[PDB]
Structure formats: structure tokens, C-alpha cells
């Protein structure tokens, strides 16, 4: 089973998986051939998961896991392990003033490292893994969604680079794929004066699709981006604010 | 489904390594593929190597240096092929010199092809930094082409024509090979990954940027390194 | 028992009536800076988390007749940090320039961006009252290992640096960054010559900077002429970037 | 500490960003030739250095010309002295502005490096384009950051620095007659919210040519009130 762009056999973790990016990526790992287990932090959502992999035709799960615990972490792995096996694609989306940022940020990267961690011990038994972190979509429009939006994808960057570096020895790489304005919740939030100022900012002149993320994402977790390590791929239509 | 069925690709400096490589994948990906060369012998090789992997194209003679080798290369391309609407500068060549050359080219060579893609209002132009193996060349060089780049995806992508790069680590090829062992080391030791790339693994992700899938992705430079950054 | 609070015009003295705080200033870089700002006529706290520390500190400031104090500080705690402030309120005024210079690739940079928000958190209110103020934050100093915790804490610093800079730029505040590169102290004169000139080989200007070269930098974006740069990092690192 | 003893040349010293560096070196103690591409503008030069007490001169020069650097610079070689700091300031679709523009700054700076490498101490300082669209600017300051680091590799060795300020939004002749639509806008995504003076670039200038900064080179610092595209 010597193919290219194919992930028959391999298990996909993906977080934040009941809407949106998460969703698409859910969808698109399932359609390469993976087995897909998508979480949400309610049971709601983890049954919302489940009942749009049946709907598309993909082996897997929806599961409630809460990246900030790390009892809920280890228990959820652990899970995956007696039921499904190693995940050894982890795609990582689980995720207005100018003063947010500090949290926002200091959070989510913590919450990375968590999951992180706890997955690389089955990645380096097999010598070999890909993690993928999703960074935040552009968030408001002005100043103080711009400062987030700057600051939590700087972070996403550097901490992406220097995961990367630790763990690059084992075949583990490590990238991340930085959304712009993308057609989802945010996009949705949508005065269309303001909307077509948006549109003028972005050299593509439209909004991504969260498809658009989701094959990003596939090529990454392929054989073929197995040099591809330490990067930040933007996804936003030439416009780039940092 | 990550498919090019229909579409010609043009990738210069085609004839070894990594344009080889990528002349290979935009082939398998269902492209018809021109590759080119600044000689007949290798664009001949070229038309060989595409045969013997069963890919429909040409190897044609081009010099991205020369505004009429351009003219006339393209006006070729289009009575007998058809409009490229893919494009991968692979062709390159004191450091000021060396740099300031090589845009040149690349704004040569993208802008004559810039006429097809906006009349079918659809492109891909995709610029392969060079590789590494002197660190003072290779960053100069590195930072012209994502500025070029950047600049180039902002003027033109009201017509949905992205513009990306792609700038290589320490890759196996022709040049590399026979490096002192000194060098070689000291560059793996750099390496998180502990190796070399093959040239297949630079041309998987110009076949991605090439898709219909990485639409939204503009402007953009990928490193494949191996975790290297210089 | 020890004590942990140690309290003709020249033409440099810019910074005039200004109270600045400077972390980790009992050596190297720490010192040359609070001496520079001291030479612009600061008046200078310098911390140390030691009472000894403190102690040199104030000795070092009175040997170079610089008015200020070292006291005692430990950024990583907010009942410090608190406690620090008043006192400094209370017995020398409102420090309006601030210098931060206070698995393991994670941990270090996450505590030292806690650190910087903690600290540059709390002297935020008296800046904001006198509509006036200068942070800087200064970068660990180089040293597979070194290269990746080098330049993700330079990641972090340059992001952390930008993001302050523009949630208090309205109130005349200005946040900056100084990226050392090899600087000399103590630890960097001891290395065997190959490993040394090695070294040197990678950096242009063939040399290694010393801590005054910094110190230099950072009493620049202490200025009023550096009032219109905010949110910069500036690298010092005689042309040597590591990425 | 000061710059007693220097000769620096300044290109675009007529007005401006130009102007207020070239006050601000004199200042400094620097002996100073500004330049212009006109007669009147060199003469219009020579009368601020007189008016402030500014010891140096107004020169014309084009620094797209091989045959206008090569005069100019033997000229000053004559007449004042070998210039040992160098602020590039002269600039000028997007490809050919920043194409030619670096052609210039490398023009000028080799012709100025054998001067500064045989008194064994340089300064370079490149200016930026004012914003004034975002693509010409993004553009133009890529090409000045890795101009400003590749050449400053190059020519370290010999205590050589060269560095670059890249200006935000600045108070000037080409940014006063901006309607007050477009200026609202620009001062809501500028953190200080206001514009910065010609005199704070010329500030950071004058600090990056002084010995203190010797150990900052290829460095390119923006000055830009936080306001970063
Ligand atoms: C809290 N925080 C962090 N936290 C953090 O752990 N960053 C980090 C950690 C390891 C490697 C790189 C980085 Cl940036 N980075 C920030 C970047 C911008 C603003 C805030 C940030
Ligand atoms: C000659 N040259 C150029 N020339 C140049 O035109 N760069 C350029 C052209 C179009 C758009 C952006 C850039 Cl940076 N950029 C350089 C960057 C580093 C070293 C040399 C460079």
C-alpha cells in the first residue's frame, strides 16, 4: 500500500473537528484513506463529529477531549489506543480589544505543547508522525483583531519552528498552515460595506473556502512533504498582516 | 483529483535535478509538460526522459537572460501546444550581480507568460529558490525571491493567478553529490530531519502549489528543508 | 541577616528626572546597561534576585556616581513584583523606562514571556498616568541546542515585543527589542581558540560585541529621538543572524 | 559618542527626510555634503548647512549615473576628504522602481568602499521609501532589508557597517496634501497615532552612525510608530 498522496492505514487525530476547518480537514484526511477521530469538547459535538464521518463515508470517531487538561488528554489517547491505535497524523485546531492577546495566545500554545507531547510517544515507536497546527482566522475587522490575529500567528510560527527542531531527528515533522479571511463563523459576522473593504485588502479579491485550508493540511500529512518541516504555510489569498 | 489533466506547464531548467523532477511530477499529475533547456542536446534529453516516463510534451531551447529567446519560445509554445498557464522557474545561473540577474529573468519570463493566464483568467507561476551547498549568496538570493514573489502574487491576483515559492534546504542532486565530506557534514548536522531531500520531495510540493486545491495560497514561500533555516 | 535595599553635569544626561528600572543588572549586560542609562542621568534601579547581588548592585552604581538603589526582585513572582513597585513609588517615584534583562525549549520561553507581561503589566499604570513611557526587552544572548532555543526565544520576544507595542502606543508608550548576538563576557573569552575562531568566521565584523555595545542600544530607544520606534527588535549581532 | 572629524555624505539632503539628516550629522559634528539632482537644490542645501552652522556643501548627483558618482565623488576627494558615512537617501512598475533603486545603492556604495576601507571604519545607511501601494512598499523594503544584510557580510571585515531605516508614516511635502479621509485612516492603524517627524528618522540615523552602534550591522530598523505592513 506504496502510494503518494494516499494515508490508507494511518490514524488522524483532529481537534475542534464539529464545524468549520476542523470539520473540512476531518473530511479531507477521511477522503485520503486515513481513520479519522475528530474531537470536540462537548458530547454533543463529538456525536455531531460522528454522525458527518458516517454521512461521508469515513471509518473513525467523534470523541470529547479538552486540550487545556491534561487528565483529559492522557485519557483520550489512551482511548484511541486500545480501540483504533496510534494516531500518528495530529492536526491540532481546537482553539474584541487589544489587550486579549497576551491569554489567547499563551494558552493555545500551551495547549499545543500538551497534545504534543503526548502523542509524540507513539510517533517516535514508529518513527514516524506529522503534526499540523491551525492557526487562527483573521477575527474582527480594525486594529484590535489585527493585534490578535499578529500575535497568535508570531507565536503559532515560532513555537511550529522550534517543535520541529526538537523532534525532527525521530521523522516527525512539524508544520502549521496560517488561515486568512476564510468563509466560516467569522466571515459570518459580515456588514457588506465592510465586507467588500475586506475583499480590497486581499489580492484574490474573495474569502478562502475552509476546503481550501483542508488540502493544505492533506499534502502535509503525505509522503511527498516529508522535507516540508518547521513551516508556516499562509492560506489567504496574498494578504498578509503581521 | 489532485489533477492537471488539460493544462500545459512550462519549467524551465528541466534537464537534471530538480527541473527534471518536477517536469516528472507535473507530468504525472496529468500536465502536458515543455521543458527547456539552454541547449539542443538538452532540450533533446528532455523529450527522451519525458518519453521514457510517458508524459506528452517537448524539450524546446530557452534563454530566460534574452527578451527574444522569450519572445520567440513563447510564440512556439502557442501555435503548436497551446498557452502555458503553468509556469516554474527553475532556470537561474558577485552575489548583487547573481540576484539581480536572476529577478530579471523571472520578471522576463513571467511577464510574457502573464498575457495567456490572464486571458483564461486562471495561472500558476511558481519560482524554485536555489539550493544550498556562500551562505551570504544563498540569503541574498533567498530574500529577493519571496520579496519578488510577494510582490508579483499582489500585482496579479485580482486575475486568480497565484504566484508562490519554493526554496529548497540541502537537496541530493548533481551538484551536492560530490561536495567535500567536510561540507557535507557540517550541513547534516544543521538538518533536524538528519538528511538530505531528494529532488522528488522539492517537485511534491510544486505539484501541490500547481492544484486547484492550494487556490488560496498566494505569495507564499515554502521551505523544504528538513527543519534548516538560513 | 541581609539586606535587600541598597540605596558637575555632563553632556550626555538626557534622560534627566527619569526613573528607570533595570532587571538583572548585577552583571555583564545587565550593568552596562544600568551604567549607560546612569551616564544619561537615569536615576537607576537595578535588581538582582540575590541580596548580594543587590548589594553589588548599588556599590557599582556609587563607584560610577550614579544616584538609584539595587533591590532585590524576582520577576517570575507577582508578590514580588507588586512589593518591588510600591517600594520603588513610595521612596524614588514612577519608573517610566523599563528594562527587562531577567522540554526546556518550551519552558524557557513561555516563563520568560509570563516574565515580561507580569513586569511590563504593573509599571504600565504609572506610564499610562504620566503619558509617557519606554520598555525594552532584551534577548538572551546566543548560547542544536543554542541554535533552536535561540531563535524561537527570539520568535516569541520579536511577537510578544510588537503585540505590547500596539495595545499601548496610544498613551506615548513605546515597546522595543534588543536581539543580542555573541557578546563578550565571561563565559565566551574562556573557549578553546578553534571552537573561538569558528566562531568569529560566522560573523562579519570578526569580533565578539561587548556588553557596553548593547548598553549603547538600549540607552538610544531609552530616548526622545527614539520616540517614533515602537514595536522594533533591534539586533545587535555585528551581522550574524541565525534563523 | 559624537562624529568630530567625519565627512558624511547625504544623497536627497534638499528636503525632507534628506534635509533633516543631513542637520542632524552637522549637529553631530559630522562635516556634511548633501546633495540634489539640480543646481538649485544644491544651492538650496548650502544655505541650510550656513543657516545652522553646518561646516560642508551642496552637491548635484545622480546616483543612476556611473559618470555623475565617479565626478562627485573625485570632487569631494579634492575638496573636503574621503566621506566615511554614507546615507543613502535618493530613491524614485513595483519591479523597476526597486530594481533600479538597489542598482543605485550599490552603485554608491561601492564607489564609496575603498575610502572606508582604507581608514578601516565605515557607516552605510540606507532610507526607505515612505509609505506612500502597500505592494510598492513591501516590495521596496524586502529588496533594502536583504540588500542592507548581503552587503553588510560582505564588507564587515574591514569595521564597515551598513544598516537601513525604514520609515512608517512620516510628516512630510509628499504626505501633508493627503486628504483627511486617508490620513484618519492611517493614524487608526499606527499605534502612537500620529505621524512621525523627518526629525526622528533623523535621529536614528544619527545614533547608527555613531560608535555605539558599531556592532549593529545589516540590521534594518523601522520607525514607524508600530505600524507595520
Ligand atoms: C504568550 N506568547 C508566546 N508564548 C510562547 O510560548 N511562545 C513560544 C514558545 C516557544 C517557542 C516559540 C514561541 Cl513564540 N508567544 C507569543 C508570541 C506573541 C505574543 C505572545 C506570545
Ligand atoms: C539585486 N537584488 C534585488 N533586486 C530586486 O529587484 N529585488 C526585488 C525585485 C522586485 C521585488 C522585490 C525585490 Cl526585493 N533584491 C535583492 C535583495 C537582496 C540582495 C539583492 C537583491
Same mark, same amino acid.
Given at each position: 500500500?506504496?502510494?503518494?498522496?494516499?494515508?490508507?492505514?494511518?490514524?488522524?487525530?483532529? =481537534? *475542534?473537528?464539529?464545524? @468549520?476547518?476542523?470539520?473540512?480537514?476531518?473530511?479531507?484526511?477521511?477522503?485520503?484513506?486515513?481513520?479519522?477521530?475528530?474531537?470536540?469538547?462537548?458530547?454533543?459535538?463529538?456525536?455531531?463529529? !460522528? %454522525?458527518?464521518?458516517?454521512?461521508?463515508?469515513?471509518?473513525?470517531?467523534?470523541?470529547?477531549?479538552?486540550?487545556?487538561?491534561? %487528565?483529559?488528554?492522557?485519557?483520550?489517547?489512551?482511548?484511541?489506543?486500545?480501540?483504533? *491505535?496510534?494516531?500518528?497524523?495530529?492536526?491540532?485546531?481546537?482553539? +474584541? /480589544?487589544?489587550?486579549?492577546?497576551?491569554?489567547?495566545?499563551?494558552?493555545?500554545?500551551?495547549?499545543?505543547?500538551?497534545?504534543? /507531547? !503526548?502523542?509524540?510517544?507513539?510517533?517516535? /515507536?514508529?518513527?514516524?508522525?506529522?503534526?499540523?497546527?491551525?492557526?487562527?482566522?483573521?477575527?474582527?475587522?480594525?486594529?484590535?483583531?489585527?493585534?490578535?490575529?499578529?500575535?497568535? /500567528?508570531?507565536?503559532?510560527?515560532?513555537?511550529?519552528? !522550534?517543535?520541529?527542531?526538537?523532534?525532527?531527528?525521530?521523522?516527525? =515533522?512539524?508544520?502549521?498552515?496560517?488561515?486568512?479571511? $476564510?468563509? =466560516?463563523? +467569522?466571515?459570518?459576522?459580515?456588514? %457588506?460595506?465592510?465586507?467588500?473593504?475586506?475583499?480590497?485588502?486581499?489580492?484574490?479579491?474573495?474569502?478562502?473556502?475552509?476546503? %481550501? $485550508?483542508?488540502?493544505?493540511?492533506?499534502?502535509?500529512?503525505?509522503?511527498?512533504?516529508?522535507?516540508? =518541516? *518547521?513551516?508556516?504555510?499562509?492560506?489567504?489569498? @496574498? +494578504?498578509?498582516?503581521?
Amino acid at each position: 500500500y506504496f502510494q503518494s498522496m494516499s494515508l490508507q492505514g494511518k490514524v488522524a487525530l483532529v =481537534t *475542534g473537528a464539529s464545524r @468549520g476547518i476542523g470539520q473540512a480537514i476531518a473530511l479531507e484526511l477521511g477522503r485520503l484513506g486515513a481513520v479519522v477521530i475528530g474531537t470536540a469538547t462537548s458530547a454533543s459535538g463529538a456525536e455531531k463529529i !460522528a %454522525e458527518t464521518l458516517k454521512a461521508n463515508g469515513v471509518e473513525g470517531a467523534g470523541l470529547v477531549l479538552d486540550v487545556s487538561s491534561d %487528565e483529559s488528554v492522557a485519557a483520550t489517547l489512551e482511548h484511541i489506543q486500545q480501540h483504533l *491505535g496510534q494516531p500518528l497524523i495530529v492536526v491540532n485546531n481546537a482553539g +474584541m /480589544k487589544d489587550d486579549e492577546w497576551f491569554d489567547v495566545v499563551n494558552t493555545n500554545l500551551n495547549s499545543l505543547y500538551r497534545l504534543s /507531547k !503526548a502523542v509524540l510517544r507513539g510517533m517516535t /515507536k514508529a518513527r514516524w508522525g506529522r503534526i499540523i497546527n491551525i492557526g487562527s482566522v483573521v477575527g474582527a475587522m480594525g486594529n484590535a483583531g489585527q493585534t490578535n490575529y499578529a500575535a497568535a /500567528k508570531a507565536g503559532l510560527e515560532g513555537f511550529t519552528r !522550534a517543535l520541529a527542531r526538537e523532534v525532527g531527528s525521530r521523522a516527525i =515533522t512539524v508544520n502549521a498552515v496560517a488561515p486568512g479571511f $476564510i468563509d =466560516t463563523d +467569522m466571515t459570518r459576522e459580515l456588514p %457588506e460595506a465592510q465586507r467588500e473593504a475586506l475583499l480590497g485588502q486581499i489580492p484574490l479579491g474573495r474569502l478562502g473556502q475552509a476546503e %481550501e $485550508i483542508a488540502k493544505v493540511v492533506g499534502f502535509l500529512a503525505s509522503d511527498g512533504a516529508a522535507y516540508v =518541516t *518547521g513551516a508556516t504555510v499562509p492560506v489567504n489569498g @496574498g +494578504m498578509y498582516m503581521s
